[PDB]
Design a protein around this ligand. Structure first.
Ligand code: HEM
Ligand code: HEM
Ligand SMILES: Cc1cc(N)nc(C[C@@H]2CNC[C@@H]2OCCCCCc2ccccn2)c1
Ligand SMILES: Cc1cc(N)nc(C[C@@H]2CNC[C@@H]2OCCCCCc2ccccn2)c1
Ligand SMILES: C[C@H](O)[C@H](O)[C@H]1CNc2nc(N)[nH]c(=O)c2N1
Ligand SMILES: C[C@H](O)[C@H](O)[C@H]1CNc2nc(N)[nH]c(=O)c2N1
Ligand SMILES: [Zn+2]
Lengths: 407, 411
């Protein structure tokens, strides 16, 4: 019931009590662990609302106060009659910050309380969504001095009137299948790029084509909008020591902005809640550039370094990997765009975990996602035992809308 | 029921049915995942069911399930348990059991090799000297002058738990660690407590950076006894780098034979508390963990200094650069000395082939992602993108507590 986590490098032992408050299911059982699997009415609503408002009033040291009981009554009466309820602005901000705080897969949560919440619950059309999103993009980008933000569109009602951003992130690069058989641009986005052109988009058919937003308001068919190019801060990639690096013609965008998740607060579901932080360098240099199914550039780079690619044991891939990641950090740092390296970010997460254990009784964390995709054991998180469990408010992954939507 | 696992790089999907044969608990529940936690005398009552489950598995594997031979063996074991309260494995059952414990070891990336395991039956051993002799023979056989051969030696099973055989060493070959009065450590910080025990037991320590520890061997629940492994049986590799001439002057070396000696082998409900086994190294075990963990030899800084890397900021990725060069050095050194070693790229690719084969022929392959993914270069290996299911099959290897915490000293 009370659980210990040990750090095997430092011998520090922490005690988790916060897991007792977990509600949702992990996917694991007593017989099987699913730790490495990526995806493992009025009546249900009031308990969820109550659970949330109790945590909210407790947070502002007003638990059991007249203002606490009055709000519970107000919300009960509103559900009883409207079938749903509306969050107070203060409740919404608290809920979003806490959904980030509870995101067990996020290494950047030391930052959780510094989150700018944009309340877009008054939005009614796709053009209105576009406006809010441009303002979010410009605010978060802040000329390279990035600031965490979330924009929250209206909550789910009967579920036939969902707001969705069809894009998986606000800013991504197009992918195109070629007669050649190969892929031009980002292979991750071939399907979406096709939905785009089929809906009208004039694809420039290049390697780094910023995708248009496909926005869905009030359950309507989505509409296309191009983000003003001047709002998309991109970084050309060069290496501090290798002059040839710039001739690979690589760039990435500065703003990582996840747009396909569902924010649940007090039983209310926000199906369009794009949020953004800033990158950890490995996300671009290891995953975006070197995944075999992504830009897959290891071979080209290793060749330009003239490494022995004849045998795996020369570690040519590992050498090229490190250089690519050096170039990513150097490029962002040189152009004054916020980026964090994996050493820094994971040291900050260990500090955050200790704060959370001290101040909250635990910190749900998914080791499989927290440990960086390179150099795992030379970061402190590798040696840190973590307990994974699901707390609300939460961000949840949700099915691609094209699989769902009826046109 | 069926469970599916997906590979996110290839989109290959596999279907697990083998998890239905799992018995033991994982530590996880519907409310909490303990996937990253390192550690999450039987009665007759439990024993015959465990023996029966095992013998049913063994006889099915030899295509003799339900045969007269199978039924007679069940009766014999039943009668032996009721009469003597335990039973003895046939040699063929022991071999099958040890190979299956390895096949079932979800944290082992090297399992493609599971069917090629030399089993040494040491169940006739009675004394610590006898254990020493068996272990020397294991080391010599496994080492095979650098052409490493996987092996396991199995000492007598647990009886009342008052007469256990134990190898007190966590691995047969490891280096001593000595805590200095100034707080620094000489040699391997992982082995300080065990080194202190050896010294207390009469070991004369050379007090250098790579002193091979003596064996401390407990037979039949007696107080353990110290033995020095003959140095001529301990193959070691001096570490040098193919391009960097100064690497040799760091004075590093490592031993060739990774030989785990502190695990408990369970077969058919019987417990083998001393079952040292050995394979060969994957390079990162040495180059990443033994050399670069902050709480082990911790050489990153010194290597990085000799490489003249920019060490003022972590974003220069100096640690990552030095880490790669050290791992090149380990693989180069082993290969040049003709000592078996596998790189993490080769080992993970072979593991994925093994896992796919096991899904097809066995219905599953329990695997612990946290341990299977190598401690460097994680996502450029195919296992990073492979979903895995972790569950516990028997026969199995289990952790057991260090014997110094539980041993009753006779004096
Ligand atoms: C401030 C800088 C931030 C950093 C450095 C950061 C770091 C990261 C990283 C490296 C990942 C894993 C990404 C991947 O491998 O795909 C991640 C995941 C995640 N983060 Fe953050 N984060 C930041 C801000 C945020 C914010 C502002 C939110 C919400 C308001 C958030 C919520 C999440 C969620 C829900 C995931 C899991 C996403 C998924 O399942 O696809 N993070 N974070
Ligand atoms: C033949 C070459 C082998 C290779 C390359 C190999 C590789 C590995 C590696 C890299 C690990 C994780 C080690 C760590 O991070 O500390 C491991 C764990 C393990 N292997 Fe193997 N292995 C091999 C042979 C064997 C053999 C012969 C057995 C038993 C007969 C075995 C059973 C195990 C077990 C039980 C673990 C988990 C150990 C623990 O929990 O401490 N392996 N293997
Ligand atoms: C199947 C699936 C499930 C899931 N939960 N999430 C994904 C998205 C995948 C998981 N990792 C790569 C990709 O997500 C990329 C977007 C992540 C950016 C996260 C982030 C957010 C804020 C700051 C820095 N980084 C896919
Ligand atoms: C607390 C704990 C639990 C556990 N199951 N195992 C350990 C031992 C740790 C696991 N990783 C480092 C150390 O084990 C070192 C020996 C592992 C060698 C495995 C091997 C065997 C054969 C060939 C190659 N490699 C500790
Ligand atoms: C199968 C496995 O869960 C999958 O490849 C995971 C591993 N860890 C990850 N970690 C992060 N941060 N992001 C990811 O996309 C993944 N992918
Ligand atoms: C806390 C965490 O489970 C621990 O550091 C693990 C992570 N993965 C590992 N993987 C292997 N192969 N060996 C290890 O010792 C560990 N240690
Ligand atoms: Zn689990």
């Amino acid at each position: 019931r009370f659980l210990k986590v040990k750090n095997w490098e430092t011998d520090v032992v922490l005690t988790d009590t916060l897991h007792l408050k977990s509600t949702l299911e992990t996917g694991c059982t007593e017989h099987i662990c699913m730790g490495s699997i990526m995806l493992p009415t009025k009546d249900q609503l009031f308990p969820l609302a109550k659970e949330f408002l109790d945590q909210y009033y407790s947070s502002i040291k007003r638990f059991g106060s007249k203002a606490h009981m009055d709000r519970l009554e107000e919300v009960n009466k509103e559900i009883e009659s409207t079938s749903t309820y509306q969050l107070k602005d203060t409740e919404l901000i608290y809920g979003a910050k806490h959904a980030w705080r509870n995101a067990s897969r996020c290494v950047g949560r030391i930052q959780w309380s510094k989150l700018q919440v944009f309340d877009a619950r008054d939005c009614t059309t796709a053009h209105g969504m576009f406006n809010y999103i441009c303002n979010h993009v410009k605010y978060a980008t802040n000329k390279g001095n990035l600031r965490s933000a979330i924009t929250i569109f209206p909550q789910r009602t009967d579920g036939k009137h969902d707001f969705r951003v069809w894009n998986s992130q606000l800013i991504r690069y197009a992918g195109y299948k070629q007669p050649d058989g190969s892929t031009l641009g980002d292979p991750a986005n071939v399907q979406f790029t096709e939905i785009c052109i089929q809906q009208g988009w004039k694809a420039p058919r290049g390697r780094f084509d910023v995708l248009p937003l496909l926005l869905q308001a009030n359950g309507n068919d989505p509409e296309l909008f191009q983000i003003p190019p001047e709002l998309v801060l991109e970084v050309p990639i060069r290496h501090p020591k290798f002059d040839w690096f710039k001739d690979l013609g690589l760039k990435w965008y500065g703003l990582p902005a996840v747009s396909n998740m569902l924010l649940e607060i007090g039983g209310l579901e926000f199906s369009a809640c794009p949020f953004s932080g800033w990158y950890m360098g490995t996300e671009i240099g290891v995953r975006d550039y070197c995944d075999n199914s992504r830009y897959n550039i290891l071979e080209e780079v290793a060749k330009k370094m003239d490494l022995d690619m004849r045998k795996t044991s020369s570690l040519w891939k590992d050498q090229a990997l490190v250089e690519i990641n050096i170039a990513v950090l150097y490029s962002f740092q040189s152009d004054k765009v916020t980026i964090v390296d994996h050493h820094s970010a994971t040291e900050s997460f260990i500090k955050h975990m200790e704060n959370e254990y001290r101040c909250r009784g635990g910190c749900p964390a998914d080791w499989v996602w927290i440990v960086p995709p390179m150099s795992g054991s030379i970061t402190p998180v590798f040696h840190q035992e973590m307990l994974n469990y699901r707390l609300t408010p939460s961000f949840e992954y949700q099915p691609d809308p094209w699989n769902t939507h009826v046109w």
